[PDB]
């Protein structure tokens, strides 16, 4: 195939101008949608706060308006999903992965409104769920939508536009352009065969998306952890150990999410009324826990800087971890629209810190700070559970800007992905797609 | 399909333990080799310095011992290549890319010694060439070498081990593990069809390689630029402009490198004696320029922090740029073993800074620092010429640690790759492989 190669080499990197320009409009739209989604979630969390004010005297009435306010918002979201767009449940990354395989439909006329308004309800009620689920699916759908509006044809355009929309979606959720692109290149692209996804086009959409984010968000960072210390060479083995712990926990946590999808289904059997009422109780639990113990609930970004700075006692960290493992499963496994990606960041940090606190006391000769392990664990559940370690690592870097910890971050991440492999675990997103594709046939 | 996919999803990411462990030993070896190569180059640059001392009185004798010391070291390297391993000439990234296509042989019994000792001679004599060429080829060859020693079989193992060796090779040359892996994923993998290259294995080898580097290098960074300022949104359009300039210059610079390969060949016709003597004169020019105007010669890492801090006059920057475009072509196009990758970093910085100095004076309302444009241009020739922008961007980030400039870096990079495309330029490494494969079927 020598003469063929010679032909291809000389024609490398010539994405059609039509796809490049459309990549630009896809990203711009996704950025704006992500911004809007973000503003909406915050606005509802506020309303909920201002409500507990009008009723901060009657502690029982207080606990009641917290539960109901979030129960209602929750149910609204569950309903919107079950009724008009069932594939807008849960994350949606597994769905967009499907679409890139050409094995699942991108029903943008249905998902955009469902996921957007659906997510506002689950997220805004204070459930343990991430924005990235919504923003990635919303962004993919937006990619299909402009493919259709402008009737662009071909495999390249369908795969490209779909991919950039999802990347611009991850980027806008974390203000992390590099992680947006890497996520596509490592995780979301078709895993087992070549594709015509244009990388240059994905880049363009991520830029535009990120610019949209900066226009409505600058001067304030999602997570500010400051500059931590460096990591001495003779300290590295400690990060390897932490990785190994994440590696055995990874798969085990995967089982629970999948098994809990099963367990929770039995509860409503599949019935849109029992289901919505189930989500109303989980949503009320969260809005309540939100007042009586915030760290057990919500997205969890707030407690990251606090955990990293060693400001939690060991007792608290264990509490938080266990609690949040619980509320994380209940929320994502329940089928509510929203990510599990971000909540896995919180779990990683909390776990990291506890390991760090132990390392600090066993080795005063190492002059450790609990925070460096928190930073290394942050992307470790990601690496062990969803098995996208390069994306995890580059995402954490982008959010915490502690480049001097790159080696221990990579070591904890690799160790996590290595021990998850060797203990027979699977990439979560792929195990969710698989099981979804296995039901879309066992019915025959 | 749905059947097959469902079976594959459930079996995703199960790299064979044999490949993982061997990825580890590949990276360890590549690290050590890269360290050793690095120590050697510096040791020779020293010797050359200590020599100009014993003769710092007779300015003519001074200029003479500079030229000769570097002429001899140069020729030695050219010869070692022409004689025992002609595919260890120039960069060697185009060669390793070939091997991953299964279109070129990995002659590790020949290249390891030739490239290693060959490069010491060109690099150590102070030629405008980068360590990454050598370290990438050397590292690929090392990857084949352990595939053979342990007789591991299959396409996966051959492609994986070869890829990790090259990634560990880029990593160890810049202390840039992330760029090491991205370079494979974006640039060096087979570009037009699926491969069984295991990403997890490449990661492992890069780690090990980087650890080896840190064991012999810590406490000192290749490039320290400090913390620069941030970039206001209303400033972004200026980075786009810069990228557009890099985008039109990219391909034009590509022509020159390729055309200069042609022009220089005519000089020696292909004859190992005229060739070696040609390299001896280029190598002597460089060791001489190294004393009478260091900024026009050498790897160029030294002048990067100086350029970024606005410590050069505009006059100097223009001089340096032009000079260094010249000495860059002469050295790489001549066929001497060594990279063009690093020298393109210096060219980017210098160009960036000049644009920055102009931006500073046109818009005092923007409150600019010349350095931010320097940082954005640094990876821009890479992006315009070799067309690996994500690798360029992540490499510069890793080396300069100014994350607040990510947006303007990405914009300059994308603009560069977009205007290089639209002005009909090609990825350089691919144009070199192409022309090498075209002489292999004519």
């Amino acid at each position, epitope marked *: 195939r020598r003469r063929q190669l010679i032909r291809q080499l000389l024609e490398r990197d010539k994405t059609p101008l039509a796809i490049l320009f459309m990549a630009a409009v896809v990203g711009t739209l996704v950025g704006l949608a992500a911004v809007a989604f973000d503003k909406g979630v915050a606005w509802l969390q506020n309303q909920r706060m201002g409500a507990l004010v009008h009723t901060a005297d009657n502690y029982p009435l207080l606990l009641t308006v917290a539960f109901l306010c979030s129960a209602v918002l929750a149910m609204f979201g569950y309903f919107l999903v079950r009724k008009y767009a069932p594939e807008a449940g849960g994350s949606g990354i597994p769905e967009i992965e499907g679409a890139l395989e050409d094995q699942r439909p991108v029903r943008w006329w249905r998902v955009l409104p469902v996921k957007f308004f659906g997510g506002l309800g689950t997220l805004g009620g204070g459930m343990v769920l991430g924005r990235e689920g919504p923003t990635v699916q919303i962004g993919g759908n937006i990619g299909r939508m402009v493919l259709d509006i402008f009737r662009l044809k071909g495999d390249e355009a369908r795969h490209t536009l779909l991919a950039t929309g999802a990347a611009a979606g991850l980027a806008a959720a974390f203000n992390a352009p590099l992680a947006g692109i890497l996520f596509i290149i490592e995780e979301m692209r078709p895993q087992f065969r070549y594709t015509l996804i244009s990388i240059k086009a994905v880049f363009i959409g991520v830029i535009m998306s990120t610019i949209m984010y900066r226009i409505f968000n*600058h001067e304030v960072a999602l997570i500010d952890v400051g500059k931590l210390s460096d990591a001495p060479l003779n300290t590295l083995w400690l990060y390897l150990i932490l990785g190994i712990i994440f590696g055995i926990f990874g798969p085990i946590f995967n089982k629970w999410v999948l098994g809990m999808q099963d367990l929770l289904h039995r509860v409503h059997g599949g019935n849109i009324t029992k289901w919505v009422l189930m989500g109303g109780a989980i949503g009320g639990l969260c809005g309540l826990l939100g007042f009586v113990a915030p760290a057990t609930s919500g997205g969890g970004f707030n407690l990251i800087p606090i955990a990293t700075a060693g400001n939690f006692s060991m007792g608290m960290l264990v509490f938080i971890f266990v609690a949040r493992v619980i509320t994380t499963l209940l929320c994502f496994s329940s089928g509510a629209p929203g990510g599990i990606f971000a909540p896995m960041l919180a779990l990683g940090t909390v776990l990291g810190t506890a390991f760090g606190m132990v390392a600090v006391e066993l080795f005063p000769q190492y002059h450790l700070e609990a925070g460096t392990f928190a930073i290394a664990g942050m992307g470790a559940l990601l690496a062990a559970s969803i098995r996208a370690p390069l994306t995890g690592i580059i995402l954490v870097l982008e959010m915490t800007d502690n480049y001097q910890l790159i080696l221990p971050m990579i070591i904890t991440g690799l160790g996590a992905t290595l021990l998850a492999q060797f203990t027979g675990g699977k990439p979560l997103y792929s195990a969710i797609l698989a099981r979804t594709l296995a039901k879309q046939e066992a019915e025959q | 399909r749905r059947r097959q996919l469902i079976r594959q999803l459930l079996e995703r990411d199960k790299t064979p333990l044999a490949i993982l462990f061997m990825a580890a030993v590949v990276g360890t070896l590549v690290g050590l080799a890269a360290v050793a190569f690095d120590k050697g180059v510096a040791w020779l640059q020293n010797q050359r310095m200590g020599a100009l001392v014993h003769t710092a009185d007779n300015y003519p004798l001074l200029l003479t011992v500079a030229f000769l010391c570097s002429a001899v070291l140069a020729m030695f390297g050219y010869f070692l290549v022409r004689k025992y391993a002609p595919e260890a000439g120039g960069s060697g990234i185009p060669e390793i890319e070939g091997a991953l296509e299964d279109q070129r042989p990995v002659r590790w019994w020949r290249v390891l010694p030739v490239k290693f000792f060959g490069g010491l001679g060109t690099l150590g004599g102070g030629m405008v060439l980068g360590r990454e060429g050598p370290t990438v080829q050397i590292g690929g060859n090392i990857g084949r070498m352990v595939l053979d020693i342990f007789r591991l079989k299959g396409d996966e193992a051959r492609h994986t081990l070869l890829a990790t060796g090259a990634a560990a090779g880029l990593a160890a040359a810049f202390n840039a593990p992330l760029a090491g892996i991205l370079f494979i994923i974006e640039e060096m993998r087979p570009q037009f069809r699926y491969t069984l290259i295991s990403i997890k294995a490449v990661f492992i080898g890069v780690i090990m390689s980087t650890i080896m580097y840190r064991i012999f290098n810590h406490e000192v960074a290749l490039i320290d630029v400090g913390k620069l*300022s941030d970039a206001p*949104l209303n*400033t972004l359009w200026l980075y786009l402009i810069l990228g557009i300039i890099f985008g039109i210059f990219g391909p034009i610079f590509n022509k020159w490198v390729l055309g200069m390969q042609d022009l220089l060949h005519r000089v020696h016709g292909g004859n190992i004696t005229k060739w070696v003597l040609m390299g001896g004169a280029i190598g002597g020019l460089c060791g001489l320029l190294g004393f009478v105007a260091p900024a026009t010669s050498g790897g160029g890492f030294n002048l990067i922090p100086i350029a970024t801090a606005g410590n050069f006059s505009m006059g100097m920057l223009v001089f340096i740029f032009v000079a260094r475009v010249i000495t860059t072509l002469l050295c790489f196009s001549s066929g001497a073993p060594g990279g063009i990758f690093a020298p393109m970093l210096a060219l980017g910085t210098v160009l960036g800074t000049a644009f920055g100095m102009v931006a500073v004076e046109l*818009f005092p*309302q*923007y*409150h600019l*620092e010349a350095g931010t444009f320097a940082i954005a241009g640094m990876g821009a020739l890479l992006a315009a010429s070799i067309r690996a922008p994500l690798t360029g961007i992540i490499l510069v980030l890793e080396m300069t640690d100014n994350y607040q400039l990510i947006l303007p870096m990405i914009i300059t990079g994308l603009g560069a790759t977009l205007l290089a495309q639209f002005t009909g330029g090609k990825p350089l490494y691919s144009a070199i492989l192409a022309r090498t494969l075209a002489k292999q079927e004519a």
Partner: antibody
Amino acid sequence: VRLLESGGGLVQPGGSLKLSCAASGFDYSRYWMSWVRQAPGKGLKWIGEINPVSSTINYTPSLKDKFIISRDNAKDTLYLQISKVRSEDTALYYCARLYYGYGYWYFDVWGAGTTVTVSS
Amino acid sequence: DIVLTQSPAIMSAAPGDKVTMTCSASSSVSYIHWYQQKSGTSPKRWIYDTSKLTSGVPVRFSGSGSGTSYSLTINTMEAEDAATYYCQQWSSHPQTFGGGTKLEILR
């Protein structure tokens, strides 16, 4: 986070003087700092600005070394000297940390000011 | 240099009145800022980028405008809003200030 300026008071026409501004509560380095003055009962007038390494130093259209702005990042102190002092230099002088949001710069935080009186 | 002219040099109003004051530029400017200067006090960044509020500025305040016409509006003034307000531009260099609007209270 405060800006305390001093050195104000009496100077005789044609003479010169040196105002200091002592910053604190933030990383004084990597902030562009500025000076603005306000004549009695009048409005604000920009004097100059100096970048965090004193690479760039800008001034309102004055004459020779009419104004000399200077910074000692080692002490987190900002300076201003006025020469050939004339009645128009009689004013309240403010120090100010500079900043921006979209890019068009603003005067982020201001000090209490110090007062210069040009009289014999 | 850009000359900024602010509308009434001096204006009276009663708490509960919607109040509007004006900054005009001799030539186009954008994203102008506003300072509040209460008696005995340093100017205090109040509105920036034409319409963004600095933290702790009550919502009754709003900014708007473009080209050569910018305003600051208090949607029902309050007595504590007694001050002199200055506008400011740095879309062109050097930057420049309005002459100020003194706001007086009627009670």
